[PDB]
Design a protein around this nucleic acid. Structure first.
Ligand SMILES: Nc1ncnc2c1ncn2[C@@H]1O[C@H](COP(=O)(O)OP(=O)(O)O)[C@@H](O)[C@H]1O
Ligand code: ALF
Ligand SMILES: [Mg+2]
Ligand SMILES: [Zn+2]
Length: 653
RNA sequence: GGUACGUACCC
RNA sequence: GGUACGUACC
């Protein structure tokens, strides 16, 4: 059953050594890990395995395709975010021999204050960490492993054996041999690795496209942007319309205008960001997709707003007409059409990877409206993860699974997917991967290519000629080789030198964490919460103090002041999510009573309703400065945990 | 919707 | 120090 190379790769794990199994994409690391799990559980009494993954869909895949075979002798349980609300994790885990979950499910249990929810690392004898190259920086995998290292270095006994699985440790952005080796050693230190274990036809093509000869739609948007910038009456405004740098600079101006309460500048900047978004969409997909971006924004008075509405209305019909003209088609789409026409003339089974969820939806719509493809028997669908925004909702575990199951045997034969499916997904019949204008690291490149499991697969890079994306793809190909050299060098290192380096790196990691925690705490304690005032980002009115805020589940920032209700208005009916939570559900959206700016949403927490505030909708004012924050975790005053008991007691008075 | 982190980009 | 996107958790 197991191939020779699978047996070879797991020999250290079978002996109890912490290891990383480094085998190519599609080589069968999962089955190898199942064998380790079986022998681990057979080889002692009372063992318990946790299998950690990084994407929701991989929980069911690993269970149904691989780990379920253990149920002839052992209890195997799977948990994701979608199923979380039903059982206490600690109960479920402790009743199982093997638990399979996304890593943050385990992390939440490790951090829990509730006896029934909580688990310790010492409740497991083996941790299998899939896609273990993510065990870096402040990713969840590394939060879990840093706690392991803190416990190890303090002398804790009974920590689990570690089995990491990866095709691609990467080079961590390093382009030198010295740097790449250091990166490999860092990953080994993070995972407490004793040995990196390894073993002892697809074609790649660059499908390059040219810039559009004529782009009257884009040209008109740039003309409008210039008009809006003239209206702002400001020198030194950015001119580089239709770029990520422009986006950054205009949002930075928007944030500065919020902090200084310059309403006209802030609103103009907010609109300019939408025109820039439209230019980026126009470059990626169809003109009409870009038009719909702007039309939706203006469909959803003040002199600045009147100017901006009029400006759009004056150009709307010309823009829509241009967007219907085939003469100005996006060459990226012309190229994609050529690829699909060549390869889907039922035979093929493909994934086209795009950056954004909205792009994936737009590509499906394009496909469905393209005469030249209607006739090739293409049955396509979008696959995204559970990310969400106003631009684009996500997909639930169940929705993702439906698409995946139909794609597996060809009920669907083409997916437009985000990076949700770049790693781990196993579709043996997938024989084509197109990467549509992506800028990624070498890991994502190797992984996404690897979704084409079939013999005689093809991998297409569809990107603009002479672009940074093409340069980065070429560089990344070289970095894969560099990575391989570096891993072999680490594998060949004298044991004494390796062990000493690992020691050094683990020590550095645990010391560096302490210093970071101290710095974060110092920042958090700078101001008394009574001295911090929140202002509406839109109208600048004061609305509460820092002392009014509490956290729920260390995430949701509620205002507990009984008179805050006079400052916000309930602005919708009840919100519904797909996922249900243990102690609360959403109520309605809330907005500033003075200007209708979105602020957050109600939480119905047991028998009370509390308003949750989104940090991005405020300017935070302290005695020292006024600042727009993107994250609650960096504010300069302390916030206490919500106490439901204390809250109910104080309200009864 | 809320939160965090990763990747890309700029400083 | 920021921007965008993505995923994950809630
Ligand atoms: N020894 C084997 N014989 C036949 N098929 C195998 C063997 N080991 C694994 N497989 C299959 O190989 C495919 C790729 O395995 P997977 O574990 O997803 O690869 P990866 O190493 O990227 O995790 C799966 O369909 C799996 O069932
Ligand atoms: F390396 Al894989 F699925 F784990 F392609
Ligand atoms: Mg895998
Ligand atoms: Zn307001």
């Amino acid at each position: 059953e197991l191939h020779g190379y699978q047996l070879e790769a797991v020999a250290p794990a079978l002996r109890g050594r912490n290891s990383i199994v480094w085998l190519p994409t599609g080589a069968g690391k999962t089955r190898a890990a199942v064998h380790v799990c079986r022998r681990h559980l057979e080889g002692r009494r009372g063992g318990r395995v946790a299998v950690l993954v990084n994407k929701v869909h991989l929980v069911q895949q690993h269970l149904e395709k691989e780990f379920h075979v253990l149920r002839d002798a052992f209890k195997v349980t799977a948990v994701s975010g979608d199923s979380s609300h039903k059982c206490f994790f600690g109960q479920l885990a402790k009743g199982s021999d093997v638990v399979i979950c996304t890593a943050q499910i385990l992390q939440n249990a490790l951090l829990s204050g509730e006896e029934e929810a909580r688990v310790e690392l010492t409740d497991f004898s083996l941790l299998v960490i899939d896609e273990c190259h993510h065990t870096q920086k402040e990713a969840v995998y590394n939060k879990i492993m840093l706690s392991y290292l803190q416990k190890k270095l303090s002398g804790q006994r009974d920590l689990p054996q570690i089995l990491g699985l990866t095709a691609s440790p990467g080079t961590g952005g390093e382009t030198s041999f010295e740097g790449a080796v250091e990166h490999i050693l860092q990953i080994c230190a993070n995972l407490d690795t004793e040995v990196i274990a390894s073993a002892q036809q697809p074609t790649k093509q660059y499908d390059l496209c040219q810039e559009r000869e004529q782009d009257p739609f884009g040209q008109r948007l740039k003309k409008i942007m210039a008009q809006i910038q003239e209206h702002m009456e400001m020198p030194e405004l950015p001119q580089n319309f239709g770029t990520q740098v422009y986006e950054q600079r205009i949002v930075e101006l928007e944030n500065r205008a919020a902090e200084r309460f310059c309403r006209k500048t802030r609103v103009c900047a907010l609109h300019l960001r939408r025109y820039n978004d439209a230019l980026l969409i126009n470059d990626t997909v169809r003109m009409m997709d870009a038009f719909q971006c702007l039309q939706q924004f203006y469909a959803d008075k003040d002199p600045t707003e009147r100017f901006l509405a009029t400006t759009f209305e004056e150009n709307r019909a010309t823009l829509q007409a241009l967007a219907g003209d085939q003469r100005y088609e996006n060459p990226r789409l012309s190229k994609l059409e050529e690829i699909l026409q060549e390869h889907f003339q039922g035979s093929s089974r493909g994934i086209v990877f795009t950056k954004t969820r909205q792009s994936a939806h737009s590509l499906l719509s394009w496909l469905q409206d393209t005469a030249g493809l209607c006739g090739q028997h293409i049955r396509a669908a979008v696959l995204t993860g559970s990310g969400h925004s106003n631009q684009a909702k996500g997909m639930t575990q169940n929705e993702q699974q439906d698409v995946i199951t139909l794609f597996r045997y060809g009920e669907l034969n083409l997916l437009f997917s985000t990076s949700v499916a770049e790693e781990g997904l196993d579709i043996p019949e997938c024989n084509i991967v197109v990467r549509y204008g992506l800028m990624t690291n070498e890991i994502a490149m190797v992984q996404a290519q690897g979704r084409a499991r079939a013999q005689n697969s093809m991998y297409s890079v569809l990107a603009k000629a002479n672009s940074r994306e093409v340069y980065r793809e070429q560089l990344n190909e070289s970095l894969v080789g560099l990575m391989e050299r570096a891993i072999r060098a680490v594998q060949a290192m004298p044991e004494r030198k390796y062990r000493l380096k690992i020691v050094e790196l683990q020590r550095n990691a645990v010391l560096s964490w302490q210093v970071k925690e101290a710095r974060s705490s110092e920042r958090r304690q700078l101001h008394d919460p009574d001295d911090v005032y929140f202002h509406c980002v839109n109208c600048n009115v004061a609305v509460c103090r820092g002392s009014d805020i509490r956290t729920v589940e260390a995430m949701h920032h509620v205002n507990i002041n009984p008179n805050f209700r006079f400052y916000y208005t309930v602005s919708s009916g009840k919100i519904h999510f797909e996922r249900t939570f243990r102690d609360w559900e959403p109520g309605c959206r809330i907005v500033c009573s003075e200007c209708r700016q979105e602020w957050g949403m109600e939480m119905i927490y047991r028998n009370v309703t509390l308003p949750i505030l989104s940090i991005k909708n405020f300017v935070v004012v302290t005695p020292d400065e006024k600042k727009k924050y993107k994250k609650w975790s960096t504010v300069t005053f302390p916030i206490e945990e919500f106490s439901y008991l204390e809250y109910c007691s104080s309200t009864q008075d």
